[PDB]
Every structure is written in structure tokens, then in C-alpha cells.
Design a binder for this molecule. Structure first.
Ligand SMILES: [Cl-]
Ligand SMILES: [Cl-]
Ligand SMILES: [Cl-]
Ligand SMILES: [Cl-]
Ligand SMILES: [Cl-]
Ligand SMILES: [Cl-]
Ligand SMILES: [Cl-]
Ligand SMILES: [Cl-]
Lengths: 219, 219, 219, 219, 219, 219, 219, 219
């Protein structure tokens, strides 16, 4: 388990992270963590590592792109003095390109995305114990669907950033891909973005695996 | 204009047809028709053929399959004594196979679909002046997406039944396919089924074209 | 089609334009365009010209007279940098004269109306590709009903402004008049102002015809 | 004062009478009578004839025609054992012919209107001390407006039935016509049917005058 | 009729005047005048004197004493430039003495009341055509009930002010007293302050009589 | 303490007893007992006699008279198999004579009151361990107020029936009368019937005193 | 994995199982399963065994005891034709003995509990492929707390019945006891029964472990 | 009775004091005192000492620790100029240690608690007639339950402060302890903090006894 006793783990991202979390504080009461993968992660950590005494904060905001994250980074991340920061961003940066293809100011293209995300990591890295970069995802098994194809390009950039910055790394797309060998997307998410409890468990598990969670500790 | 003065036109279907229509009556107002294509068709007919004196009823019910239509046909169609019946059914029949793949009782497979729809059309036809068969659709440009592929099969059934029974026929898939040469699905419907006003205009326009509507009457 | 690819079309007016649109932005999501003629226009343009990539904004505000429009013109119109502006105003300027005949500060008489509307056109004209002036209307077939008689005087002023300024022009009254040869007003609007979907389609069609929309493009 | 101590006065009609009255009872309160002319009549009687000891019941139902009155007459009128019955019906009977001109089953044409109203009055008359027949009305000063013209025809029927049956008669059209020499309809009712407090006072005053109310009792 | 054509009549007072009126403006739409005597007065004036074109504003605020009135007089009365001001205040000034006998800062005793009310009249008198002073009331027929006894002392002060300042004068208590020879208070108001429609008609009539309203004009 | 361990105490009455109790059961909770004297009695018994193990049921219904109690007695009292039944009824029986003086069917006059209450007590008495008869009350210090005078007559009936049947008796009028030596009614209840927490403590304390409650148990 | 492809797994119980599940069906969605352990179990199975094709139904009802389960067993369990039935009942059976100690009819004592649960298991067993018996629990680390002590007795009954009937068995008390070595009860559940997401993960994990779930499948 | 005529008694504390009281004023209307022990105290004082004319204010705020009290002391206590101040605080200062054991900034440990509470007393003492210190409590009969054990340490500090400062003193824990010889905590409070009406009566009684209230005055 990478996360140590007494440390503060902060999650940030878009609606997939937000899931109705309490604003502004996003802390403690799970009511306050929202009803998706962040809350599930905290639950499982408490169920299996109750003694670790990890504090968790949810700074997800529905609708955000990486440009939105940069705009609130000082208040929502730096000022919180986390020990660990998890970032999952990109879904909207890409989705807007396809659902509002003519409101271009809503779009964040790949070059801007990469540099902005790198800038967040590099600002934050000296201040924390570690960073976990989760790729964005699209719940769609056809690699050639235009939105899946674009999402994968953003995900590959995330992976590159994580390698270069020695951040931990969660390929959320690869985790969905496995399940999409059996299920059609709609079984997980009508809209291919916002999933059922099962999708949130896919995410929570993928995150927990990357931080060295054991389902039954040998320890 | 295939529909004539004084005739009663009854639309039945699933949520695409329902669109919040007044239950049980589906008639009577400044709003009883709901807020999608049926209302738009009735609006445009009134704007361009005010003298036609058409009565229009909306018997759409969200979530229905053709099995659900059969269960209420006597009360919701036959007992209304319509002159024209428009049917658009199959979206759910198919979609449940994909979004709830293990709840097999919710699925209406092709055999049940063909047999039921065929039987309703045969029974109804000698009781009315005319039938309009609209295909189901899925807002997805890739013909080999599994749900689009199945939906196209169901649409072939509708087409065959309309041909055999001399009904009017609206290929709603073809109408969406034309727009999908330009737009990604999410620009019309995040879930690929319930679209924006634009999608309901696509539907309304495909319906009107089939019944011989003229945008500016040529006389 | 007068409107070009990539251009921004902004609608302003009173409740007939507003129809519950999102405030302040009035953009994109049709939810955001409201539920009347503006949304129908966008829908039909997307259904038939999806490739044009036109951005549409709804700045209608329920209750406004032309005096109200002038008061918000800088923020709601100029600052939006539209390429095309459609104005439909006058209904309230006149209605107040008849429903609150003794709260005279609510009234905008014809001389003030004309000069204010001219002032909006003349301010805006050098900044845009084009202006569309839609007359106000009253859904009442008797030319001698006092409110219809006054409305027609305002409409004639609109027409004069449009001629003088080389703006496009939509005679909404003439469009209702045609339909009122068959329907009594109440069939369209109990209050003779706020109409059913059909009235909104009357308006949307009248607008679309003036901008060279084709229902089936030969192009 | 035609109404005497201890008598029970029952009002029946459509929304003009209903005005949000308590269902099913229409009696019993600080509010059971609704918020329009019936409450005003009861208020003024209590203010000026507190000793009369009148019980007053409001059996108005929004949307009713005389066909609807017939269907509930036994339960809502006869079974209440009233002493005086006031009827004001016909607005909807007529209005549906104009606002829903093609839904012919909602219309109550003159033959059905005369026959039904006549029959209810004849049946009721020997069971009660007295009947007040109020005409329907339409708040429209132009006698050749088609709906005003029809409404005046229906009012002639009421007048004839009251004359023949020796009932009291209130010409509510004439009461509005006097005010309409000064005010445009919209100043009293946008929809020409459901008026302001002022319209309900016009109605209440026309009712009171007919039953011999004195504003300052002359004794 | 004391009130002239085109003039502005403003009502101020406590809840009996407020009756849910629109804040802040209190004007025009009766919805905006509230649902009690002020609205009834306007209704009757419109029903019987529609040509007078009187503008009416309701500045009642629930809970107010005369001390509260003085605190808002500049904004709510002076700045409105009325031609006629009606004041009805005192109920709370007295009621607080009896319902919250130990929260003495809520009480306005008679000496303070008299001088404050005189101060309002004297400030206003040079600015208006006329002032109407309505006494407070208590719906209680026993002159020796402590609250009735106190209310009558306030009412006698009002009468004295009106005489001295040549204001019009409405003895609301005397009007209730007449009706209380027949009805027990509860029939009009459970709480002896807030009455039914009938109480509001008692008030509206009493006011109208003092301004020379005729129920049927001989004129 | 007249009530003994393991006994079931059932309270019945009108709104004074109901106080928002859970329907139909009136038992079972942190709130099923409502928010007035019944809850207070149960609270104080638990605070001071926790070991008594009393089950307490609240069958109060707002608006009831003794005629209403008779209609539900079998289901709400007898079928509950209580050990002790507390009755407080008569407020409405009387009040309707004053607040709705002309709706005579809502009144329960003394003959009907005495006969009904007597009969319920006689029928119930051999089925239970004991009965507590609480008088109705009216929060009004003037014995010659007409409603107070009648209410005192009804209370004499209760007292007589309790004496004759060897029931316990609580004179709730006398309890209020003591406080009314100091407080005007409105300080306890604007409407002289539904009081503050203080009034419900007056009631609870009068009930407890009768059943032999000690505030500090003397043993 | 004890549960096999295509099988239907039905959970029944009290609020711990219910967690806001859809009534009556408890199946069908993105939410019909409620928001606690049953949803989490279904989520994790789908995330890790997507190919298993399990149908899962939630027949939990808040407030139930085993007596309540018996009353609905035929309709809610037997008629659903499940393959696997999971039961978690006893919390209320016990808790009512402590929170409503004098309402003895709400209690289900050990004799009734053992006999009823035994009978449901015996009846169900030959109709299904398998049964999972989960113990009730109380989130309280002190074995001599009276309610914890009783709850442990009830859990011994469940354990004995599962042993005798060859059912699977989940000791939910033991799962909580492990966490309670570190956390005070209130950190998981203020009321010691309805826990946080963490408590529902404790439950879900204890269920999964018993059915042979692997967090990372070893194949 | 320690409290004198005309004096102001102010209560402050956490939710147990707040109980939904009106913010900010917390005065008079009991609605305004909330629905627990503060309101019950006022009720009983009014029922038994109506002539004392005591003014009572409720400044409880749900969630507060003593640190929160100090932060609002000037505005909520000093500025109110009370004659008597009752303080009950400590529950949250302790509870947070056990329900959010890793959000340590929420915790107020005993040393800080003692000094802060002393500081409030010492600031206030010269300004008031008297201070009543109520211990915090935990409804849990096992002295060795960790939270009960801690609460008792805070309570012993309160007692020490009260002795040293000659404040009145209410041992709320001792009052619950007596009742807990019979009832399991859940019968009073599922969460062991927020109790039923009975718990609030335990508190109200304990307070009243310390101020010399007599249930039947000999006086
Ligand atoms: Cl989002
Ligand atoms: Cl659907
Ligand atoms: Cl408008
Ligand atoms: Cl109506
Ligand atoms: Cl008031
Ligand atoms: Cl009641
Ligand atoms: Cl439960
Ligand atoms: Cl609290």
C-alpha cells in the first residue's frame, strides 16, 4: 500500500470524480465524497486498512476540462496540502469536440491538454508524496469510433506524462476494454461516459490495484 | 397529402413517440401531444394545412416494446377508432438485449417482434383508412456496431411488413444516417436513442415527407 | 441559405423569443434555446444543414418592450459579436396599452418605438453580416380590433425600417393572417399572443423562408 | 332579498364558479368556496345581511359543459337538498367549438345545450324554492366576433328557459358589455374568459342585484 | 367619488392591508394587490368606475406597527408620489401587548402611537390630495375584553387625528360591531384579527362608503 | 401512580390530542405520538417512571366531535384492547356552533353530546381497567363569553359522566383558568383553542396530577 | 465462484439489504438494486466476472423481521424462481426488544426466529440451487453490551441452520468485529446498525469471500 | 425559583440545545425556541410561573464545540445582555474523536476544553446574575465504553468549573444514568446523543430542578 498512515489523498477531475460530492470541502462524510469511485475507494480502504487513518478529499467538478482544473488548482489542490493527488481528466476536453462540434471554445485539443496536464504535475510534484494519473476513458470497444480514437490519444499522452514524471499510472481505458469484450457499452453506460455502480467499481479497482491495495492482506 | 380532412391520426410507440404526452388521453391541447416529433408533425400540419381539420392522438408510452403494444392495442388503438395509425416500435425490443443482456424476459427477439408487429398491422388494417410504419432507429453511423446492426434487421422487418400490407413506410434510420455523415452521434443524442429537438425534427420531416407534405404548397 | 458556415445567429425579443431559454447565455443546448420558434429554427437548420455549423444564441426576455431591448443591447447583443441578429419586438409595447391602460409608463408608443428600433438597427448594422426584422403580431383576424389595428401600425413601421436599412424582413402578422382564415384565434392562443407549438411553427417557418431555407435542398 | 333566512344556496358551473373550491364538499370555510364570485357574493351577504343565516355551497368544476353538469346533477345538486340553485354554464360548451374545432365530441352544440339545460331546470324546479340562471359570457365587445356571437345565442337560450320556468335571470354578458365600453378585453382577461378580481366583482354584483341585495339597506 | 380620474391611491398598513401583495411594488396586477380588502376595493372601483383610471398601490407589510411604518415612510409612501394615502395601523401595536406581554420592545403604547401617526399625517398632508385614516379593529364584541378595550382607545385617537387634520375617516371597529351583533367572532376570524372574505368585504365596503362610492351610480 | 406496569394507555380526542400523530397506528416511536400533550405525558412518565413499561397509543384526529369518535370507536379503541382510555372531546362539538353557526349538521348539541359520550364510556368501562375523562376547554377567561359558557356546560357533562361511572377526571378548563388570571388568551393561543408548548404543558401537567404522578418520587 | 453463469441471485432482508431498492421489482437497472452492499456485490461481480451473466434481484424491505419475510416469501422469493437466495435477517427482530421494549408484539424472540428462519430455509432449499445465510450484526465491539450479546445469539442460530442445511454462511458480525479492533462504532454507524459506504463494503466483501470471489482472478 | 421576574435566560450549546430554533434571534415564539428541552423548560415555567415574565432565548447551534461557542460568544451571548446563561457543550468536542478519529482539527481535547469553558464563564460572570453549567452527556450505561468514559471526564471538568466559579450545575449524565438502569440506550436515542421527547424531558427536568422549580408551588 503506497499510501501511508495519516496521509491526505485528494482526488480531482470531472463528473466521474465529482459524483455529487459536497462542495466546497469534499471531505469526510462519504455523503461528502459522493456516490462513485472515490467513495468506493475510501470504503474499501477503510474496510481493509481501517488503521491507516487516511484522509480523503474529493475535488471533482462536473463538466471540467483540464483548462478548468488549472483555473482552480491553487485553491482546490495546492492550498489543501495533500500528500497524494489523483487526477482523472480529459473526457470533456474530448467529448465537447463531438457533442458540441461548433462551440469550439469548449474544446481542449491534444497539444494544449498535454502541456496543461504536464504543468499541473510539475507544479505539484515537489509538494506531495506522489501523484496518480488516471487516464480518461470512453466506454466504447471500437478503437476506430471517432471519440474512442481521440480518447486513446489523450490516454497515451497521460501515460507518457506519468512515465516522464515518475507518477503512478492507471489505464482506465484498458480496464473498461477488458469488460467490453463481453458487454456492449450500454450495459455499463447509455452515454458511454457516465457508468453504473459496476463502472465505478471498474475504476475504483483499477485505482486500488495501482496503489498496492490487497483485497485480503498478507502484509 | 395522404391524410385528409376530418381524419383522426393516432401515433403509437415508445418514449420517442410519448415525449411526455397526457395520459391516458393523449389529445386535447396546448401540450397533450408531448414535446417531440408528434407535436412537431401536428404543428407543421396546422401551420401549412390549417384547413385539413385533422384530429391527432398520441398513445406513445415510454419503455414499450411491441409486446407492450399488443397488451394495450384494443384499448389504446382499436377503441379510439382512428383513421390513420402510425407505429414506431423496436428501439426497446432491441436495446434491452444490449443494456440488460442477462434479463432475457425483457428482450423481444426477432421472431416475437415480426410475429407481433405483423399481427397488429393485419388486424388493424381493415379497421382504418391507413397505416404508417416507421422503423426504429439507432443514432450510430457504424453499421457494424452490434446494436445498430440489429436495429437495421428489425427495420427490415418493418419495411417488409409495410410492403406486404400496403402501408406507408418511413425509414427513420436512413434519415438519421444522412445527418450522421456530418455529425457524431453525441451531437444529436448522448445515449444514441433520445435526441435533441434536431432529432425530433429529423423524425417529423421524415414522417411528413412520406405523407406528401409540402413545405410551400404548390397550388 | 443566407446564413453561412461558422456564423453566429442571435435572436432577441420578448417571451415569444425567450420561451424559457437559459439565462444568461442562451446557447447551445436547445434546452438552452427554449421551447419555441428559436429552438425549432435551430432544429430544422441542423436537420437539413448539419454541415453549416451555425451557432445560435437566444437573448429573448419575457415582458420586454423595445425600450428594454435598448437597455441591454450592449451586453446582450453587441458584446456577443453575432454575425446575424434577428429582432422581434413590439407585442408588449402595444399590449400594455390595452391590458394596463392606466400604467402608462409601461406603454411604448409608436413614435418612440420607431426611433428606438431604428437606433438598434443602425448601431448594429456596421457590425454584422445582416439583420432580420420580424414584425410583432397579434393573433386576431379582425383588422379593426383595437389591439390588432395598433399592432399592424407597428408592423408597418418595422417593414419601413427593414426597407430603409436593407435588413431582411419577416411579416409574422401576414403568416398568422393566412391561418386565421380558417382557425379562430383561440385554437392557436387563448390570449392571442402566446401560441401553441403550431404558432411557433408558423413563426419558425416564416423566418426560415426569409433566410432561404429549403425543406429538401436542391442546392 | 329573494333569499331568506336559513336557506341553502348552491352554485354550480365551470371554472368561473369553481375558482379552486374544496372538493368534493364545496362548503365549510374560510376558503372552501374558492376565490372568485361565489366567495364574493357570500362575503357581501355576510357583511350586509349577517342575520340571514344562509348556507352556501360551491359545486363548480373547471372545464365543465352542461353535459358534465347532467352527469353529476343527482349527486352534486339533487342530493344536496338545496333551496336555491344558481347555474352558470355554456362558456366551455361554446369555447371548445373554437379552441378545439376538430374535436367535435368535446363540443356541446345548441340543440344539446338547450335540451339538457332545459331538462335540468325542469327537473330541479319542483324540488327547490328557487333557481337563478346566469348566462355564460365572453369578454369581447365585438358582437360579430364569432365566439361572442355564439355565446350571445347560448345566453338567449338561458334567458328563454329562465322566462319559461319563472327562474331568476342574470345577464352576465350585459354586465361585462357595460365595462367593455371603456376597457379592452385584455384589461379584464387575457383569454377573454377567466378574469381578474374586477371581473369576478362584475359577476358578483350582477348576481346580487338580481336577488335584491342592497349595498346600504334602506330600512 | 372623492377619487379623481388618473389619480394614485396608495394603501399602507399591516397584514390586513398586505394580504400577500407583491413586494416591493405592490402594483397593478391584483395578484400584486393581494387577496383582501385592497384588492376588493380596486375590483369594485374597476367594476363600477372603469373609466376613472385610478392607479392603486399596496404597501401593506405583515407584522408592522406604526413604528415600522415611520421607518419605511420615505421609500414606501413619499417616493411613490401618491395622490391619496389610506393608513390602517394599530392592530399589532396593541396585539403585542397581549400575545407577547413580556417582549416589551414589540409594544407601541398609545402616546407613542398617537404622536407617530400624527407625524405621518402631517408629513404627508401637504403632498397629497387627501388622506384616509382607517381605525385598527379587533373582532370581539365585548367592549371590556382587555384587547378590545385597548383597541378602542387607539381607534378613538385615530378619529381625533382625522378630525384635527381634516382627513377622511373609516371606523372599522364600528363596521365589525354591527356584524358582531349577530355573529360570534370566530365565524369571522378564529384569531379575532385576520378575517374571512366576509371580513375583508366589511372593510372594503366601509372604505368605499367613506370615499363616496355608489353601488349603482346615479352620478 | 394509577397506571401500572405493563399497561396500555390509549388517548383519543380531536386535534389537541392528535398533534400530528402517525396514522393509523399512533404508536411506535420517536414521533408517532405527535408533538403536544400526549407526547409530553409519555415523555415525563418515561423520565420519572422509566420502569413502568407503559405502552401508549394516540388515536387523536383533528376536527373530530364525539359523533366522529362514535363512528370509529370499535376500530380505534375497542379493537386496540387498551387498559386505560383517556378521552378529551367537545371542543369542536361546541366550536362549530360558533364558527359555522348556519351549518347545523356540523354541530353536536348537548343532547347528542351527553348521550354519545355517556354511551361510549358505559360500553368501554367493563372492557378496560380504567377511563380518564378530560374536559374540553376554551382559552378565554370571561365566563360569559358565549363559547366559554357553552364549553363550561359541556365540561359539566363530562364531570357528571366521570362521577357516575367512577372514571378519573381532569378539569382542563380549571387548569387554563388559573393561568388566565395572569395571561391574556392570545399569549397561549391566538384562536383560543390550539395553544403553544406552554398550553400543552398545562394539559400534560393536569393529566399527570390526576393519575398520581410525582415530579420527584417521594420513596 | 459458487454462482454460475446464467443464474439468478436474489437477496432478501431488511433496510441493510433494501438500501432504497426499486419496489416492487428490485431489478432492472442503473439503480434498482439500491445503494448499499447488494449493489456493491453486483458491481464487483460485473467488474471482475462480466461474463458470468448473473441476474440479481433485491427484495430487501426496510423494517422487516423474519416474521415479515415469512408473510411475503411466496410472492417475493418462491415466485421469482431464483437459483440462489441470500438472506440477512434478525437485526430488527432483536433491535425492537431494545428500542421499543414494551411493544412486545413488535419483538421476534429466539423461538419464533429460529422456527421461522428454519422453516423458510427448509422450504426454499429444494426449490433452488443454493442458499446463502448471512448473520445479522450489531456494530458494537463489547460482547456484553446487551444488544450485541443477543445479536450474537441470533447469529448462532443462523450459523446452525446454515450447517444443518448445507447452506453457505457469512458471519457479518465477525467482519465488523475485525474493524472494530480499530474503529469506535460511531465511525461506521452512529446508530450501530446503518453504516457508511465502508460498512457496506465490509458486508459486500464478506459476501464475496464466501462465494469464492477473487479480486484478481488467478487463471 | 432562582430566576426572577422580568429577567432574561439565555441557553447556548449544540444541537441538543438548538433543536431547530429560529436563527438568529432564537426568541419568543416557541416555534422560535425549537422543539426540545429549551422549549419544554419555557413551557413548564409559563405553565407554573406565568407571572414571572421571564424572557428566554435559544442560541444553540447544531455541531458546535466549545471552540465554536467562543467564536460567537460576543454576538450571541454578551451582546444579548442576559441575566442568566445556561451552557451545555462538550458532546461534539468528544464525539468527533470517535466518529471522525482522523479529522483531528474537529476534535477539542480536554485541556483546551477546560480552559475555553472557564474562559467563557469568567468573561460572563461579572455581567450576569448567574450561570448554569450543564454537563455534556452520552446515553450509554457502560462507564467503560470509550466515548462514555471520555464524556465523563469532560463532565467532571464541568463540575469542577461550576464549583470554582459558584455557577449552578446540572449533571445531565447522572440524570440519564438513572433511566439507563432500566432502558437500553436505543430506547432513548439510536445514536446515543440525540434523544426522544423523553430524553428532552430528562434534560428539562434536570435543569428545572437545579433552578428551584416546583411542580406544584407551595411558595
Ligand atoms: Cl463531466
Ligand atoms: Cl422508450
Ligand atoms: Cl412577453
Ligand atoms: Cl372552465
Ligand atoms: Cl399583521
Ligand atoms: Cl380539532
Ligand atoms: Cl431495517
Ligand atoms: Cl450537535
Amino acid at each position: 500500500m503506497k499510501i501511508g498512515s495519516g496521509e491526505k489523498l485528494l482526488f480531482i477531475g470531472d463528473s466521474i470524480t465529482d459524483c455529487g460530492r459536497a462542495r466546497p470541502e469534499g471531505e469526510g462524510s462519504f455523503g461528502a465524497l459522493g456516490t462513485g469511485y472515490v467513495a468506493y475507494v475510501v470504503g474499501l480502504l477503510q474496510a481493509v486498512y481501517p488503521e491507516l487513518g487516511i484522509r480523503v478529499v474529493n475535488k471533482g467538478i462536473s463538466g471540467n476540462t483540464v483548462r478548468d482544473l488549472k483555473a482552480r488548482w491553487e485553491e482546490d489542490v495546492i492550498a489543501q496540502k495533500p500528500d497524494w493527488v489523483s487526477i482523472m481528466i480529459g473526457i470533456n476536453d474530448v467529448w465537447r469536440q463531438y457533442d458540441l462540434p461548433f462551440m469550439k471554445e469548449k474544446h481542449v485539443y491534444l497539444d494544449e491538454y498535454e502541456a496543461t496536464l504536464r504543468s499541473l504535475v510539475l507544479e505539484t510534484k515537489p509538494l506531495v508524496k506522489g501523484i496518480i494519473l488516471m487516464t480518461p476513458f470512453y466506454i466504447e470497444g471500437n478503437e476506430q469510433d471517432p471519440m474512442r480514437r481521440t480518447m486513446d490519444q489523450y490516454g497515451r499522452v497521460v501515460k507518457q506524462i506519468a512515465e516522464e514524471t515518475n507518477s503512478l499510472f492507471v489505464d482506465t481505458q484498458a480496464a473498461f476494454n477488458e469488460v467490453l469484450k463481453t458487454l456492449y457499452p450500454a450495459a455499463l453506460a447509455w452515454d458511454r461516459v457516465h457508468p453504473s455502480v459496476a463502472g465505478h467499481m471498474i475504476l475504483a479497482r483499477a485505482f486500488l490495484r495501482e496503489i498496492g491495495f490487497e483485497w485480503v492482506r498478507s502484509r
